[PDB]
Scaffold this active site. Structure first.
Site, PDB file in Angstrom:
ATOM      1  N   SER A 171      53.398  13.003  40.547  1.00  0.00           N
ATOM      2  CA  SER A 171      53.040  11.688  40.060  1.00  0.00           C
ATOM      3  C   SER A 171      51.576  11.488  39.724  1.00  0.00           C
ATOM      4  CB  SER A 171      53.455  10.612  41.055  1.00  0.00           C
ATOM      5  OG  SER A 171      54.842  10.341  40.953  1.00  0.00           O
TER       6      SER A 171
ATOM      7  N   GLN B  90      64.766   7.276  40.295  1.00  0.00           N
ATOM      8  CA  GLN B  90      65.229   8.283  39.359  1.00  0.00           C
ATOM      9  C   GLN B  90      66.376   7.761  38.515  1.00  0.00           C
ATOM     10  OE1 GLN B  90      63.445  10.741  39.125  1.00  0.00           O
ATOM     11  NE2 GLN B  90      62.630  11.293  41.148  1.00  0.00           N
TER      12      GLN B  90
ATOM     13  N   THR C 265      48.763   9.775  44.710  1.00  0.00           N
ATOM     14  CA  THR C 265      49.415  10.914  45.315  1.00  0.00           C
ATOM     15  C   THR C 265      50.411  11.503  44.330  1.00  0.00           C
ATOM     16  OG1 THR C 265      51.191   9.518  46.169  1.00  0.00           O
ATOM     17  CG2 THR C 265      49.348   9.967  47.650  1.00  0.00           C
TER      18      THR C 265
ATOM     19  N   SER D  52      53.716  14.795  44.203  1.00  0.00           N
ATOM     20  CA  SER D  52      54.370  15.954  44.771  1.00  0.00           C
ATOM     21  C   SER D  52      55.481  16.417  43.860  1.00  0.00           C
ATOM     22  CB  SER D  52      54.982  15.621  46.119  1.00  0.00           C
ATOM     23  OG  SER D  52      54.050  14.970  46.953  1.00  0.00           O
TER      24      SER D  52
ATOM     25  N   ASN E  98      54.505  20.930  49.438  1.00  0.00           N
ATOM     26  CA  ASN E  98      54.647  19.483  49.563  1.00  0.00           C
ATOM     27  C   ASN E  98      54.557  19.119  51.039  1.00  0.00           C
ATOM     28  OD1 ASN E  98      55.336  16.806  49.556  1.00  0.00           O
ATOM     29  ND2 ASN E  98      57.261  17.070  48.445  1.00  0.00           N
TER      30      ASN E  98
END
Ligand SMILES: [Zn+2]
Ligand SMILES: [Zn+2]
Ligand SMILES: [Zn+2]
Ligand SMILES: [Zn+2]
Ligand SMILES: [Zn+2]
Length: 362
Positions: free
Chosen positions: A65, A121, A316, A318, A343
């Protein structure tokens, strides 16, 4: 200590990062910081556990992200160039969305995850452009527009896609042929070319298998970027004070506008920001799952507001095999980039970053 200089900076960075690598079995990390606008680089471990290839500032990591900051900058650039205005309804920039719920969502709401409960998602089977279009056309809002923030790849993904289309170019082309070259990022990619593959780290999953990012609908926009600490720090430098292309300057500035808050975190385009100085506890809370996993009502801004230089801007990111964090404080001339091929917990990223930024401020 409260002493500055090269020696204490290294003691702090090494002393913070090395134990963390061990604790989370992180194979490699590239770290880069700015102090009074001067850059310092620290590399640890390996990019490829099998070959033993050492991490450098040129190693490519997936940043998850954190990619959304570049997506947002591209979107902002399109706005500056006249492709759209933030208060335009989404369907003004997507003919196939006319008559859908996106008649009542703005481009800003889409970019800031506040369109009304677009999910984290896409549903499993939404994996082609045609299915994506049907999905959005059929979507029914959970919340009134602008009232709730729910972190969402379909949301900012559509924003990026439509922003690029507003300039008549596909997203990946606009990114690779215009935005990255104008930012002077020459080793940053969505599709890594053969010539750069030798520098591409492998990620390492929870099961300890080498892994790389999953392709997907709007993956480019949501988590497309691979980059190393040196290029990513140059992007951060552009966000500290940029003098060059006026349009790019304006676009970057627009990513520092605040639209709403959840607790002490204020949402911009891509970047999420805090007061500065800020406590570790506040930075942890704003980056907790309760803010990223879940829908939260927002504290609305009467109008969007330029948040300025006295802020800590962060993101942040991952993927299955990677964990990234970036934070910067324009007024103080300080910044950190931390890129790893595991991660590992966000709480650890934030605690390390806060400790290091505290030393950089000396
Ligand atoms: Zn001090
Ligand atoms: Zn140094
Ligand atoms: Zn399919
Ligand atoms: Zn389209
Ligand atoms: Zn280039």
């Amino acid at each position: 200590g409260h002493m500055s200089g090269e020696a204490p900076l290294t003691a702090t960075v090494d002393g913070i990062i090395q134990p963390m690598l061990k604790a989370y079995r992180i194979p490699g990390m590239a770290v880069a910081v700015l102090k009074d606008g001067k850059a310092h680089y620290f590399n640890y471990g390996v990019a490829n556990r099998e070959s033993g290839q050492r991490v450098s500032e040129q190693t490519l990591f997936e940043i998850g992200s954190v990619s959304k900051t570049l997506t947002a900058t591209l979107g902002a650039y399109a706005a500056v160039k006249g492709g759209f205005e933030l208060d335009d309804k989404v369907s003004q920039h997507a003919p196939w969305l006319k008559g859908s719920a996106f008649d009542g969502v703005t481009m800003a709401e889409l970019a800031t995850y506040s369109a009304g409960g677009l999910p984290l998602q896409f549903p499993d089977e939404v994996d082609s452009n045609d299915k994506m279009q049907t999905y959005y056309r059929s979507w029914s809002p959970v919340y009134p527009a602008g009232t709730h923030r729910q972190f969402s790849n379909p949301s900012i993904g559509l924003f990026g896609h439509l922003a690029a289309n507003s300039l008549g170019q596909p997203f990946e082309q606009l990114m690779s042929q215009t935005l990255l070259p104008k930012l002077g990022l020459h080793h940053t990619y969505i599709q890594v070319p053969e010539s750069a593959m030798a520098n591409y780290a492998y990620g390492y999953s929870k099961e300890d298998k080498p892994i790389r990012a999953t392709p997907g609908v709007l993956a480019a926009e949501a988590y497309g970027i691979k980059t190393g600490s040196a290029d990513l720090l140059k992007f951060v430098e552009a966000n500290m004070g940029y003098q060059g292309d006026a349009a790019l300057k304006s676009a970057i500035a627009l990513t520092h506008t605040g639209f709403h808050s959840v607790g002490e975190m204020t949402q911009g385009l891509g970047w999420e920001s805090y007061d500065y100085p800020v406590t570790e506890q506040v930075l942890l809370a704003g980056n907790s799952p309760a803010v990223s996993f879940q829908a939260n009502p927002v504290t609305r801004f009467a109008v969007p507001k330029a948040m300025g230089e006295q802020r800590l801007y962060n993101k942040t990111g991952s993927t299955g095999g990677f964990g990234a964090y970036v934070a910067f404080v324009p007024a103080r001339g300080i910044a950190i980039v931390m890129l790893a091929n595991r991660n590992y917990p966000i709480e650890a990223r934030v605690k390390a970053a806060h400790a290091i930024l505290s030393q950089l401020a000396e």
